Design goal:
- The structure is cut from a larger assembly and holds 8 protein chains of 8 kinds.
- Helices cover about 25% and strands about 0% of the residues of chain A.
- Chain A has one helix at about 10-20.
- Chain D has helices at about 30-40, 50, 75-90, 90-100, 105-115, 120-130, 130-135, 265-270, 300-310, 340, and strands at about 145-150, 160, 165, 175-180, 185-195, 205-215, 225, 240-250, 270, 285-295, 315-320.
- Classes of the chains: A mainly alpha, B mainly beta, C alpha+beta, D alpha+beta, E little secondary structure, F mainly beta, G alpha+beta, H alpha+beta.
- The complex binds magnesium ion (3 copies).
- Chain B binds 3 RNA strands through strand 5 and strand 6.
- Chain G: Belongs to the universal ribosomal protein uL18 family.
- Chain G: This is Large ribosomal subunit protein uL18m.
- Chain G: One of its GO terms (cellular component) is mitochondrial large ribosomal subunit.
Chain lengths: ~35, ~110, ~100, ~350, ~45, ~55, ~120, ~120
RNA sequence: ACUAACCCCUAUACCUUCUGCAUAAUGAAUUAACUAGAAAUAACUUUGCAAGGAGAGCCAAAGCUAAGACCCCCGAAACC
RNA sequence: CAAACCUACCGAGCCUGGUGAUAGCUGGUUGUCCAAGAUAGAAUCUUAGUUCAACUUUAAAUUUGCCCACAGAACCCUCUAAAUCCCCUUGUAAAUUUAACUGUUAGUCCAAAGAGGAACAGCUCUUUGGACACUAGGAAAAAACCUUGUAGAGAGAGUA
RNA sequence: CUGCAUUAAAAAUUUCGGUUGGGGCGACCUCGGAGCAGAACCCAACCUCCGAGCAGUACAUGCUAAGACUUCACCAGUCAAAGCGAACACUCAAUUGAUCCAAUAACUUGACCAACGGAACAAGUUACCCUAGGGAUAACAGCGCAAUCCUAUU
């Protein structure tokens, strides 16, 4: 609990980068589908 | 001030521990544990085993002595059907008192 | 402690330990309890009882007293009707 | 970290929203009544009875007794309710009750108990004494027929045996008197065994008396399968219990296999076990009543051992385990001078090589 | 113990408690029984 | 830290010479107690003789 | 010589006995029960039994207490039990009926003080 | 404060989706384990160092066989982040005394009892 | 290392003091010579003898005798 | 009366002797090779030291030692915390006792939980773990971050 | 003149306990309870405080003796079956002080030694100062931090 963004540990930083959300991607952009 | 150190009070022998007569089971500032079967208590509420055997911890019904007015007042105000429970420690004797053996042939 | 005296060139003995401790030939040392004659009125009978026995010393204190005492006091004595005669030897001692 | 309980909480049923509305114990006795009614109830946690209380097998105890007698409850209740109505009617009886001066005849009420609750109390008491666990290897029996035995001593005095009382071997030197109710056409078997009298095999036991095929109450004409032998409890061996067993025979039974020579002064021959004896007989055997008493050593036991058995009397002693001491250390710190005496074996002085 | 499932079995003060009337019931009511006979006054 | 009590010596009246110490109030008469005497193996009267100190 | 169940100094009643006498006083009947420490009951004398009912006026009076007291005294005498223990509450110990019940033990030959265990 | 980890029991339940993905048979569990340390014991708590010591995993990339029993499994779960666990396959069965010197643990996880160092004629 | 001295690549002097010195903390221009771990109470190892050992004395309830093996240098302001 | 001067350093001259004065302080402490080897505390005119204890070393005797399945360790008080103690199996080879002493306990940084009149950081101080004062590789240079240890030669290879 | 006493005078020897940036003025040093330290034990400050340096009731508050616990050492402190002997291991968180020595026929007693593990008894000032050291420790300067402050935007 700090006011200077509390700089993150490298190991914790890699954990967040790996566990980032990935939206599902359609095969065809619905916008170009009949 | 307040630079006092710990009193080193707690459980000395855990459940299922083999003990001898006179071994201290636990020491406490208040009656956290209550003596059960073949367990004695001193003035300082220290718990020791009068017999030699296996230490056991169980939960039993608390029935205070009638001369204990403070506790007698407590259980009189309880709702009907309420039963107080407290943790009790007992030791289970292992060896028998003795044996009968031949000593003479007269 | 005088390791080498100026008149004989030999180790001396601290007389302080002689007046306070008793050594058994087995190597054990026997002492009293501090304050066993001080303020007896403010002590419980159980405390006073355990204050007036003769107790042994541990390994470090025994080594401490041996170094401060010459070999004269470590000999075997044969005093007549000595009260501590039976305690000079250990019986049934394993390791 | 928390773990949900494996069962209902002791005080979960009580509502706490209307705790002041709920009535209180208001007395010590009412809480105590609830205390030990709830104490005997089973629980899913560790209890005192789990470690200390004796454990019984899940199988129900097998009963080998006679079928219970059948009575008319309504008629019995009507007679009982009218009996006390007239009893309460008398002013003299009521005067004694209010004055706390009334008395009851102890002899008369005991006789009534022997017919009403006698068999049940005797069975309950016999279970406590361990008769059912040692012999029969675990069973239950109700002594429906009462049995009275009194030992003849002197010229007028008697030594009755009801249950678990104390009778000296001197008073049991001679054959006792057996009195019990029966009718014609009934065959009876009498057996006496010493539960704790065995000197060699702890599991086995010693037979002391055996009467078979008793015509009614006439015990004189019964067949003497084994001669009567007075008990011989060894001095210092504790206190022994001797049980009188009464059997009812539906048909005549041959006892040649279990017959013993007269006199039977051999301990090996006198050895007998009720188990495998009732087992081989239960097809035509059923018990009728039991009675037992406790026996100690006296001067007469010396006569029995030396003359009747032609042997030396054994003397036993109760020996306690030696006291426990911790392992002796080279440097016992802060221990009294008497510490070395605990591990000393002899108090005499020693001099080694000198 | 807290971790064990039998935690809190010794809790006892939760069964023990730690005028304006309502809209259906009355707040406080007092009755007065005067009499020249003390025995009758207390008996009632 | 006013000293309100005093330590006094109790001497047996049996003549054995046995003594023991007990605390007493300053504003009080001399105490004649009944105490066990190890010499005579029985309880006998003890009377106060001297004042030891003030506590 | 049998060891007694020592302890339980913080609860009532204590358990340092071999045989205990328990007397139960209900609304209609009074039950006198004698049992061992381990739980097994040896002998009982309750007013419910028809044997003593024919001779007693009521089952909830001092006369009833004397009736079962002598009955229990004769039952204990013929069962071989001579020594026992009684641990009543202060009010029941002060009840007049109980004291006369103790008198039944004295005249019956029953002693309510168990002998001390010989440790050595 | 940094202390030991109590791994939830829910992690070790083989759902049917994992069964055909890894090829394991719940009805016929594998008899033995292959354990291989692939991470340094340094910069790790001391209690994990002792567990690695007990299982004989000192030198990295050195296969070791262990019994698939709850006691061994309990120890393995502590250091599951430092080792690789594979089942043991015996296509030729348990080796006999005659071929005890002819065994060879191939990299795919089976112990073939016939090692000839000769090209397959097929 | 190289055919090749250099050119290529790699590499933050020594001692001491501190958690941590390439440290811009001390010491050293260089050479030669001189310059700093002294003791056997107990214990350990190895012989001799053995309920005795020791070349008066001393120790001994397997001990006694003998041997081996552990304890530094320079520097004050002062006092008489 | 400037605390001046008394043979070119007088708050008490100089020389010799006691004297190899003492110094818990500074500096120093000489041939080769191998092995074991680090951070609980208490007392102290004591925190620049010393003693006990802990840790560490050597030799000897003995048998259990670490890990840990259930069961078990409080109530008034639900930060209902992470977790500890105890502990059969199993994996393993250590552990306890006896004898003999030296040396260290003026530490640093990181991750986490905290404390310092109800201070987001910073400063100081506790607790758990790791690293450093022991090798190498990688983050630009890098004591404390990541990878990795048991030791040599090779102009081999697979990886972190 | 000598010896022994009492007053002065002039002198002799020795010392300046620690903690609180410094000084002034003050505060603290020993013991116990809660908070940190949430669940075996333990765990620190400049820590937040609150208290303690007694009293009461006994007069078997007698004598022996297994087995145990501990304020992280020692010293010290605590519980206790059983037996003897009596009746029919007191309350209270702390409520305290070692050795030597003194008194005492003896049993016993003697401390605000509170700097509370206590030296039998010793204060100030030095800018006239000296020695051995310390950036483990101040001022000068450097570096960390921006508590605050300034500016610039919403
Ligand atoms: Mg504290
Ligand atoms: Mg010098
Ligand atoms: Mg090494």
């Amino acid at each position: 609990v700090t006011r200077h963004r509390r700089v993150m540990h490298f190991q914790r930083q890699k954990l967040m980068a790996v566990t980032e959300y990935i939206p599902p991607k359609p095969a065809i952009h619905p916008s170009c589908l009949p | 001030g307040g630079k006092s150190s710990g009193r080193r009070q707690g459980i000395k022998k855990m459940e299922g521990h083999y003990v001898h007569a006179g071994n201290i089971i636990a020491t406490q500032r208040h009656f956290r544990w209550h003596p059960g079967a073949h367990v004695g208590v001193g003035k300082n509420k220290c718990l020791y085993a009068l017999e030699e055997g296996i230490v056991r911890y169980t939960k039993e019904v608390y029935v205070p002595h009638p001369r204990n007015t403070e506790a007698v007042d407590l259980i009189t105000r309880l709702p009907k059907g309420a039963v107080l429970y407290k943790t009790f420690v007992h030791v289970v004797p292992a060896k028998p008192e003795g044996t009968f053996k031949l000593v003479a042939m007269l | 402690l005088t390791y080498f005296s100026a008149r004989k060139g030999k180790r001396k003995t601290v007389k302080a330990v002689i007046d306070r401790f008793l050594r058994l030939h087995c190597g054990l040392w026997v002492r009293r309890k501090a304050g066993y004659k001080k303020k007896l009125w403010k002590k419980t009978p159980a405390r006073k009882k355990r204050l007036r026995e003769f107790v042994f010393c541990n390994k470090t204190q025994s080594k401490l007293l041996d170094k401060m005492t010459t070999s004269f006091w470590k000999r075997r004595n044969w005093y007549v009707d000595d009260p501590y005669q039976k305690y000079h030897d250990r019986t049934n001692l394993k390791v | 970290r928390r773990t949900p309980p494996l069962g209902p909480m002791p005080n979960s049923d009580i509502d706490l929203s209307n705790l002041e509305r709920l009535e209180k114990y208001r007395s010590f006795d009412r809480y105590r009544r609830r205390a030990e009614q709830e104490a005997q109830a089973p629980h899913w946690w560790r209890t005192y009875r789990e470690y200390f209380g004796e454990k019984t097998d899940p199988k129900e105890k097998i009963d080998i007794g006679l079928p219970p007698p059948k009575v008319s409850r309504t008629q019995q209740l009507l007679e009982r309710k009218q009996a006390i109505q007239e009893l309460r009617a008398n002013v003299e009886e009521e005067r004694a009750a209010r004055l706390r001066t009334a008395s009851v005849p102890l002899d008369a009420v005991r006789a009534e108990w022997e017919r009403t609750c006698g068999p049940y109390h005797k069975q309950r008491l016999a279970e406590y004494y361990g008769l059912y666990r040692d012999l029969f290897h675990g069973a239950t029996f109700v002594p429906r027929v009462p049995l009275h035995v009194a030992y003849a001593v002197g010229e007028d005095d008697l030594m009755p045996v009801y249950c678990g009382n104390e009778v000296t071997p001197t008073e049991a030197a001679q054959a006792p008197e057996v009195t019990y109710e029966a009718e014609e056409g009934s065959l009876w078997t009498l057996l006496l065994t010493s539960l704790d009298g065995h000197l060699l095999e702890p599991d086995a036991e010693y037979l002391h008396w055996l009467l078979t095929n008793i015509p009614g109450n006439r015990v004189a004409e019964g067949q003497v399968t084994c001669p009567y032998l007075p008990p011989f409890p060894a001095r210092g061996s504790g206190i022994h219990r001797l049980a009188f067993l009464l059997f009812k025979q539906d048909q005549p039974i041959d006892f040649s296999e279990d017959a013993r020579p007269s006199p039977c002064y051999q301990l090996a021959q006198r050895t007998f076990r009720t188990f495998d004896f009732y087992k081989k007989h239960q097809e035509t055997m059923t018990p009728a009543g039991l009675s037992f008493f406790q026996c100690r050593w006296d001067d007469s036991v010396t006569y029995i051992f030396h003359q009747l058995l032609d042997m030396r009397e054994p003397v036993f002693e109760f020996v306690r385990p030696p006291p426990y001491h911790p392992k002796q250390k080279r440097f016992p710190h802060r221990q009294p001078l008497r510490y070395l005496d605990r591990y000393r074996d002899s108090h005499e002085p020693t001099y080694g090589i000198y | 113990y807290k971790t064990k499932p039998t935690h809190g079995i010794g809790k006892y003060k939760h069964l023990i408690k730690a005028n304006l009337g309502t809209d259906y019931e009355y707040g406080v009511l007092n009755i007065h029984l005067t009499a020249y006979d003390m025995t009758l006054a207390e008996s009632y | 830290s006013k000293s309100k009590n005093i330590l006094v010596r109790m001497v047996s009246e049996a003549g054995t010479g046995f003594c023991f110490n007990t605390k007493r109030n300053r504003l009080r008469e001399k105490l004649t107690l009944l105490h066990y005497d190890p010499v005579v193996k029985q309880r006998v009267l003890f009377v106060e003789k001297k004042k030891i100190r003030s506590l | 010589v049998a060891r007694k169940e020592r302890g339980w100094r913080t609860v009532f009643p204590s358990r340092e006995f071999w045989h205990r006498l328990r007397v139960i006083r209900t609304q209609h009947h009074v039950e006198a029960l004698v049992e061992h420490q381990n739980g097994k009951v040896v002998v009982s004398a309750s007013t419910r039994e028809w044997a003593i009912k024919k001779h007693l006026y009521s089952t909830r009076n001092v006369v009833a207490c004397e009736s079962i007291g002598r009955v229990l005294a004769q039952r204990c005498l013929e069962a071989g039990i001579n020594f026992m223990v009684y641990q009543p509450t202060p009010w029941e110990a002060a009840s007049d009926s109980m004291k006369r019940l103790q008198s039944a033990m004295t005249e019956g030959g029953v002693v309510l003080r168990e002998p001390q265990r010989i440790y050595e | 404060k940094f202390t030991r980890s109590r791994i939830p029991e829910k992690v070790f339940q083989a759902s049917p989706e994992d069964h055909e993905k890894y090829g394991g048979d719940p009805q016929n569990p594998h008899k033995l384990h292959i354990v291989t340390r692939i991470k340094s014991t340094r910069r790790r708590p001391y209690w994990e160092k002792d567990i690695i010591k007990m299982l004989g995993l000192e030198k990295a990339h050195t296969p070791q066989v262990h019994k698939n029993i709850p006691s061994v499994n309990a120890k393995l779960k502590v250091v599951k982040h430092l080792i690789r666990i594979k089942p043991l396959k015996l296509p030729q069965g348990l080796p006999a005394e005659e071929n005890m010197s002819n065994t060879c643990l191939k990299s795919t996880g089976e112990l073939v009892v016939q090692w000839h160092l000769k090209p397959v004629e097929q």
